[PDB]
Structure 1
Amino acid sequence: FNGLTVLPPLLTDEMIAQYTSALLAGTITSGWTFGAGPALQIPFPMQMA
């Protein structure tokens, strides 16, 4: 009421959740490869090895 305003964030919580889900799927299905170039699939036990 006295001239103070709060501005909404540019990225809504849904977009942040989508970003985190994308990162998690990438790290599950492709290991560390997708962080340094094209995403290459690999079975999860072999990635754990």
Structure 2
Amino acid sequence: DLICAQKFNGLTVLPPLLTDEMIAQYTSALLAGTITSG
């Protein structure tokens, strides 16, 4: 669609280094460490 259309005129989009799974893992680690150790 429009997002794909832009791709065809020398405009490109790169993917982020960290994926949502890794972000979620970091957040869960922080939360567990907090609630178990102040």
Shorter-chain TM band: 0.7 to 0.9
Gaps of 5+ in 1: 31-48
Count of residues in Structure 1 that have an aligned counterpart in Structure 2 = 31
RMSD: 1.9
**TM-score of the two chains, using structure 2 as the length reference:** 0.76
Gaps of 5+ in 2: 1-7
Higher RCO (CA < 8 A, seq sep 6+):
1
**TM-score of the two chains, using structure 1 as the length reference:** 0.60
Deviation >2 Å, runs of 4+: none
Structure with bigger helix share is 2
